[PDB]
Amino acid sequence: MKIVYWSGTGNTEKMAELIAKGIIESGKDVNTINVSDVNIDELLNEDILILGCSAMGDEVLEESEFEPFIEEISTKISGKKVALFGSYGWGDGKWMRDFEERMNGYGCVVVETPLIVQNEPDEAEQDCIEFGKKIAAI
Numbered sequence: 001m002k003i004v005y006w007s008g009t010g011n012t013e014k015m016a017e018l019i020a021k022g023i024i025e026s027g028k029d030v031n032t033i034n035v036s037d038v039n040i041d042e043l044l045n046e047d048i049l050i051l052g053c054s055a056m057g058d059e060v061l062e063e064s065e066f067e068p069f070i071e072e073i074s075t076k077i078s079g080k081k082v083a084l085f086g087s088y089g090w091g092d093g094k095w096m097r098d099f100e101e102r103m104n105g106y107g108c109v110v111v112e113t114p115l116i117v118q119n120e121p122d123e124a125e126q127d128c129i130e131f132g133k134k135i136a137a138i
């Protein structure tokens with residue numbers, strides 16, 4: 001499997017690592033890829049797209065890298081299963097509510113409730129691992 005993410009301080013990166021850990025513990029392989037190193041064609045080949053990005057300016061996806069990545073794949077993912085996650089700070093998930101609506105609008109099947117964790121996982125480390133296990137069970 002593959003996990004593609006953007007992280008500015010490492011919070012979402014840690015989430016990605018824990019999600020990967022859960023998938024691996026379930027017995028499957030998974031590569032964790034920073035959005036800046038993503039290979040679109042190899043990504044679109046996956047049965048499930050696991051995408052993560054923290055909440056950025058005014059509750060939006062990160063603008064310089066993650067956003068353009070989503071835009072580029074937006075027309076090639078109808079019918080594709082996707083799982084969304086990310087870390088946030090002072091808000092309550094507005095950027096993720098919008099991210100989910102967005103992918104649904106592209107025709108994606110959002111397979112799990114999006115995983116949102118405040119700041120560094122910490123107490124939520126197991127929740128991250130479990131989200132990965134849910135995805136692996138599909």
Ligand SMILES: Cc1cc2nc3c(=O)[nH]c(=O)nc-3n(C[C@H](O)[C@H](O)[C@H](O)COP(=O)(O)O)c2cc1C
Binds near residue numbers: 009013088
């Ligand atoms: C410029 C900027 C804007 C942010 N905007 C939001 C926001 O609108 N809502 C929110 O809950 N957190 C917001 N945050 C907080 C980050 O989402 C939070 O610190 C998160 O843990 C960062 O994860 P990352 O290290 O993976 O980037 C913002 C942070 C930065 C740097």
